[PDB]
Amino acid sequence: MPQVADLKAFSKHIYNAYLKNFNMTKKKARSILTGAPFVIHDIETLWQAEKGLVWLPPYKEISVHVFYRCQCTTVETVRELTEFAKSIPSFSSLFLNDQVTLLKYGVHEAIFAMLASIVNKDGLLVANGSGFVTREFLRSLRKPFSDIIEPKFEFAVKFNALELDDSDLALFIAAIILCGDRPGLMNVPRVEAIQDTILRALEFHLQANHPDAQYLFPKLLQKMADLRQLVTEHAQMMQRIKKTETETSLHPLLQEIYKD
Amino acid sequence: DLKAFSKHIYNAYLKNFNMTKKKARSILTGKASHTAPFVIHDIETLWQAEKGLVWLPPYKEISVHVFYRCQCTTVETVRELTEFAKSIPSFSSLFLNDQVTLLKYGVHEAIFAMLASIVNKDGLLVANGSGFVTREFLRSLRKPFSDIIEPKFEFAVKFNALELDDSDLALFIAAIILCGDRPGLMNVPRVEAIQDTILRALEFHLQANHPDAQYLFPKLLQKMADLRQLVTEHAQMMQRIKKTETETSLHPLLQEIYKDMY
Numbered sequence: 001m002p003q004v005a006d007l008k009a010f011s012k013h014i015y016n017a018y019l020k021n022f023n024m025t026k027k028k029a030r031s032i033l034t035g036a037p038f039v040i041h042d043i044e045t046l047w048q049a050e051k052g053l054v055w056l057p058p059y060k061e062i063s064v065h066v067f068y069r070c071q072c073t074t075v076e077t078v079r080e081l082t083e084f085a086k087s088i089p090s091f092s093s094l095f096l097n098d099q100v101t102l103l104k105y106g107v108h109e110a111i112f113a114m115l116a117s118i119v120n121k122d123g124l125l126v127a128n129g130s131g132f133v134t135r136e137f138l139r140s141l142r143k144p145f146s147d148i149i150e151p152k153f154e155f156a157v158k159f160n161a162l163e164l165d166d167s168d169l170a171l172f173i174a175a176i177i178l179c180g181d182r183p184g185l186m187n188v189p190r191v192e193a194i195q196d197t198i199l200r201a202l203e204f205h206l207q208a209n210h211p212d213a214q215y216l217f218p219k220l221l222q223k224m225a226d227l228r229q230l231v232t233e234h235a236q237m238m239q240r241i242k243k244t245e246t247e248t249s250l251h252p253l254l255q256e257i258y259k260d
Numbered sequence: 261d262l263k264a265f266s267k268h269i270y271n272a273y274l275k276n277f278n279m280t281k282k283k284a285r286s287i288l289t290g291k292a293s294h295t296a297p298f299v300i301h302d303i304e305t306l307w308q309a310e311k312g313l314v315w316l317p318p319y320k321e322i323s324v325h326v327f328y329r330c331q332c333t334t335v336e337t338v339r340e341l342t343e344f345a346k347s348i349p350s351f352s353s354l355f356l357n358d359q360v361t362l363l364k365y366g367v368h369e370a371i372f373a374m375l376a377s378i379v380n381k382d383g384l385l386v387a388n389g390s391g392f393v394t395r396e397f398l399r400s401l402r403k404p405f406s407d408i409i410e411p412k413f414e415f416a417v418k419f420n421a422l423e424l425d426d427s428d429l430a431l432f433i434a435a436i437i438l439c440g441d442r443p444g445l446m447n448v449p450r451v452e453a454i455q456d457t458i459l460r461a462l463e464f465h466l467q468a469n470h471p472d473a474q475y476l477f478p479k480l481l482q483k484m485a486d487l488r489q490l491v492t493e494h495a496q497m498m499q500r501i502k503k504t505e506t507e508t509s510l511h512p513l514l515q516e517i518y519k520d521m522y
């Protein structure tokens with residue numbers, strides 16, 4: 001079976017792309033969270049985490065400081081997501097502008113998907129896994145900043161119940177980046193064709209890697225839809241931070257992604 | 261290090277551009293190492309080149325057919341320029357969005373600077389130098405399209421009077437692409453810093469490669485200024501074509517480059 005033959009190799013390639021670009025894989029992340037990273041749960045422990053136990057604009061307050069490290073995390077992941085996508089021959093063949101349009105509208109989606117990897121019901125891993133910030137502490141932050149937090153956890157725990165691994169994730173992230181309906185795409189048919197190849201690869205892969213999971217594939221299609229929505233609710237809160245939190249900075253890259 | 265810099269840009273140029281000025285100049289003069297290009301100066305010759313000899317939208321008229329080939333040439337050049345710019349380690353470290361902005365406001369400046377390499381007072385080479393389209397025939401074209409051509413020639417001949425070789429050109433085009441004052445540049449200081457390195461490289465390279473060239477460095481900076489003016493007018497001429505020549509297509513990539521240019 002040619003089609004099934006190509007796809008399996010095309011899926012392995014993407015996997016190798018994911019493996020050499022992301023500093024944090026679920027394999028690595030899931031081991032740390034089970035069986036030790038310094039637990040951050042208050043101001044005192046965070047300060048400790050900054051001084052050495054684990055680890056930006058001038059300090060301002062606690063909630064704004066966490067928001068900044070959240071921004072940085074995005075700036076770093078966006079680089080990795082850039083190298084990931086470039087490592088797909090099909091992607092880098094498109095003119096640079098379409099590549100930008102894809103990354104711009106898809107990185108946050110890919111981010112919250114991958115965020116589920118370093119997350120469990122009680123908190124998330126930080127600083128290459130050396131730290132673990134508690135969800136309860138994250139909630140305790142100031143209302144404007146603590147709102148962008150909780151939705152990510154609700155999505156993450158429900159997502160982790162699907163029990164996907166890095167090989168599935170690589171394909172998943174690839175399918176999110178290569179999306180045909182992004183605003184202003186120049187070569188839609190070319191991008192659409194690629195997304196279809198990635199999905200067919202994911203489909204076969206899921207049958208091989210998860211032979212007993214009932215409707216995993218359509219479920220993952222729904223999660224892609226769930227992510228597009230999660231990004232929207234997030235972008236809205238990000239819009240509220242820019243309006244009401246006038247004293248707090250916004251990294252230039254995030255500024256360019258959220259621009260209309 | 262600064263030399264290692266120029267050498268890397270030179271190997272990047274030679275590796276990403278099939279048609280270099282050396283090869284271009286070899287054919288344009290007469291060297292044995294090459295075949296003779298077919299001369300296209302009318303409809304019969306062009307049609308002759310289209311079939312075999314030398315070598316899209318349905319053929320409507322000659323002026324529009326050529327315009328289209330000019331559009332394609334630009335598109336493939338833009339592919340080569342992306343690969344070139346990318347081959348500069350420092351450039352690729354910039355966020356993609358900034359790489360696009362740089363390429364958007366720079367590709368045409370680069371293109372009209374390299375047009376000089378394959379151009380002469382009587383015409384220009386086409387299809388890998390296997391054809392030579394006459395300047396005359398280009399002027400013969402129906403008014404609107406005959407206009408976006410002559411200026412390129414006017415500039416090219418003059419630019420060719422500075423007798424630059426591919427080694428100069430490698431750094432020259434690099435200096436164009438990494439222009440720190442492009443509209444919407446996210447990380448300006450970084451692009452301005454990389455630009456400075458490139459120019460110091462150019463200045464340093466022109467002393468060795470051109471021991472007698474009086475004021476060459478400042479002359480080229482003026483050319484870079486000249487090139488920006490040439491694109492502004494070029495863009496203006498195109499947006500006009502898009503309005504009045506409502507039936508003539510415009511490649512989506514060109515539509516996106518010109519869109520915000522005024």
Ligand SMILES: CC[C@@H](Cc1ccc(OC)c(CNC(=O)c2ccc(C(F)(F)F)cc2F)c1)C(=O)O
Nearest residue numbers: 065066069070071073074126133148149152238254
């Ligand atoms: C506004 C930042 C992000 C979105 C976002 C939204 C939620 C979220 O996590 C729940 C993270 C990722 N955050 C982190 O990786 C992170 C990193 C460090 C710390 C802390 F506390 F240690 F400082 C807390 C964190 F949530 C990112 C963006 O909009 O680009």
Ligand SMILES: CC[C@@H](Cc1ccc(OC)c(CNC(=O)c2ccc(C(F)(F)F)cc2F)c1)C(=O)O
Nearest residue numbers: 325326327329330331333334386393408409412514
């Ligand atoms: C308008 C299309 C170009 C601009 C432009 C302006 C001038 C010019 O050359 C003088 C070329 C490049 N043209 C070609 O490479 C070219 C290619 C094929 C033919 C021909 F004659 F064979 F049809 C004629 C040509 F000038 C391109 C663009 O805006 O990107």
Ligand SMILES: CCCCCCCO[C@@H]1O[C@H](CO)[C@@H](O)[C@H](O)[C@H]1O
Nearest residue numbers: 096097100101338342363364516517
């Ligand atoms: C290497 C050649 C690159 C050519 C790039 C042309 C880019 O055009 C710009 O693409 C942006 C999205 O990426 C749009 O938001 C801008 O409105 C548009 O003007």
Ligand SMILES: CCCCCCCO[C@@H]1O[C@H](CO)[C@@H](O)[C@H](O)[C@H]1O
Nearest residue numbers: 082103104256257259356357360361
């Ligand atoms: C790999 C990460 C890429 C992040 C890209 C963020 C891109 O923002 C967009 O950059 C375009 C120029 O490139 C501008 O024309 C658009 O107005 C701007 O919204």
